[PDB]
Amino acid sequence: SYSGYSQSTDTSGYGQSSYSSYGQSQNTGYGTQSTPQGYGSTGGYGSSQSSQSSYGQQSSY
Amino acid sequence: SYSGYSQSTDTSGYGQSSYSSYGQSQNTGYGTQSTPQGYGSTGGYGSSQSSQSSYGQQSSY
Amino acid sequence: SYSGYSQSTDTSGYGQSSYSSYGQSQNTGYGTQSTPQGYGSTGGYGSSQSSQSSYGQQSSY
Amino acid sequence: SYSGYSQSTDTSGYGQSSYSSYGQSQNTGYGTQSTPQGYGSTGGYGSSQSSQSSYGQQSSY
Amino acid sequence: SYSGYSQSTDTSGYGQSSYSSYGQSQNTGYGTQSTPQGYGSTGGYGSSQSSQSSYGQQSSY
Amino acid sequence: SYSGYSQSTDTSGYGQSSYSSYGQSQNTGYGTQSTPQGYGSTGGYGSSQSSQSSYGQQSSY
Amino acid sequence: SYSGYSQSTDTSGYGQSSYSSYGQSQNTGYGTQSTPQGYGSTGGYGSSQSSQSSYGQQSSY
Amino acid sequence: SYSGYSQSTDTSGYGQSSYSSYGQSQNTGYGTQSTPQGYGSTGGYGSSQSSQSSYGQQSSY
Amino acid sequence: SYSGYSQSTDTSGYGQSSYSSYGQSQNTGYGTQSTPQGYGSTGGYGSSQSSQSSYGQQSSY
């Protein structure tokens, strides 16, 4: 809570990734994937009191 | 809560990613994926008290 | 909580990965994978009191 | 909690991996794999009191 | 809790691995594997009191 | 808890492995393997009081 | 707990192995193997009081 | 607990092995093997009081 | 507990073995073998009070 530097929180979506490809190459993201549901990536330091759920996630067929 | 630097929170959508491709190359994002539902990426540090849910997410067919 | 440096938390989505490929090469992300559901990647240091669940995750067929 | 450096926590998604491939080569991510469900990668140092579960994860058929 | 350096915790997803391949070579990630469920990779030093379970993980058929 | 250096804990996913291959060579990850379930890789030094289980893990058929 | 150096704990996934192969060679990971279930690789020095179990692990058929 | 150097504990996954192969050669990991279940590789010096079991491990058929 | 140097404990997975092969040669890991179950490789010096068992380990058919 006190003195925070380089604070970066990310559940999905290339949190911290660069130079995926260079020159001739096929750059394709994740593709098929289901991210959280409800409190995806709990950020905002201080207090996180919640409740959620998910049952039926599908990506690409 | 006190002294915050480089504070960046992102659940999905390339949180911190650059130089995905260079020159000849096919740059394709994630493609098929379902992000949170309700409190996606809890930011705004201070307090996060909520409740949600989701059951029936589909991406591309 | 006091004095924080290089603080980076990421459950999925290439937390900290660079130079995946260079020049001629096929850069393909994860592909088929299901990330958390509810409190995916618990960040925001301070307190995390929640409850969730998920039973029915599918990626690519 | 006091004096933190090089603090990086990641359950999946190449936590800390670079130079996966160079020049002619096929760069393919994990492929088929199911990440946590509920409290995937418990970060945000301070306190983590939760409960979750998951029974029915599938990746690629 | 006091004085922390080079603190990096990762359950799966190449925790700390670089130079997987160089030049002509086939770079393939794990492939088929199921990561934790519930409290995957317990990070955020301070206290981790939770409970979870999972019975039905499948990767690639 | 006091004075910590080179602290890196990883259950699976090449904890600390580099230079897997060089030049002409087939770089293939683990392949078929099931990681923990519940409290995979107990990190965050301080206290870890939990309970979990898993019976039905399969990787590649 | 006091004065810690070169502290690295890893149950599976090449804890500390480099230069697996060089030049012409087939680099293949473990292949078929099931890692712990519940408290895989008990890290986070301080206290580890838990209970778990697993009966039904399979890797590759 | 006091003054710790070169502290590295690993149950499986090449704890401390390098230069597995050089030049023309077939580098194959363990292959078929089942790692612990429950408290695989008890690390985090300080105290480890738990209980677990496993009866039904199979690797490759 | 006091003054520890070159402390490395590993039950399986080439604890401390290097230069397995050089140049033309077939580098094959253990192959078929079942590692502990429950408290595999009791590390974390300080105290280890647990109980476990396993009856039904198979590697490769």
From Swiss-Prot, chains A, B, C, D, E, F, G, H, I:
Q: What is this protein called?
A: RNA-binding protein FUS
The record's subcellular locations are: Nucleus
- To which protein family does this belong? Belongs to the RRM TET family.
Describe PTMs of this protein.
Phosphorylated in its N-terminal serine residues upon induced DNA damage. ATM and DNA-PK are able to phosphorylate FUS N-terminal region.
Q: Which disease is it linked to?
A: A chromosomal aberration involving FUS is found in a patient with malignant myxoid liposarcoma. Translocation t(12;16)(q13;p11) with DDIT3. A chromosomal aberration involving FUS is a cause of acute myeloid leukemia (AML). Translocation t(16;21)(p11;q22) with ERG.
Q: What does this protein do?
A: DNA/RNA-binding protein that plays a role in various cellular processes such as transcription regulation, RNA splicing, RNA transport, DNA repair and damage response. Binds to ssRNA containing the consensus sequence 5'-AGGUAA-3'. Binds to nascent pre-mRNAs and acts as a molecular mediator between RNA polymerase II and U1 small nuclear ribonucleoprotein thereby coupling transcription and splicing. Also binds its own pre-mRNA and autoregulates its expression; this autoregulation mechanism is mediated by non-sense-mediated decay.
Expression sites by tissue: Ubiquitous.
Q: How does it assemble?
A: Self-oligomerizes (via N-terminal region). Oligomerization is essential for chromatin binding. Component of nuclear riboprotein complexes. Interacts with ILF3, TDRD3 and SF1. Interacts through its C-terminus with SFRS13A. Interacts with OTUB1 and SARNP. Interacts with LRSAM1. Interacts with SAFB1 in a DNA-dependent manner; this interaction tethers FUS to chromatin. Interacts with MATR3. Interacts with SNRNP70 and POLR2A; these interactions couple RNA transcription and splicing.
Compositional bias ranges of the Low complexity kind: 1-39
Which positions carry Phosphoserine? 6
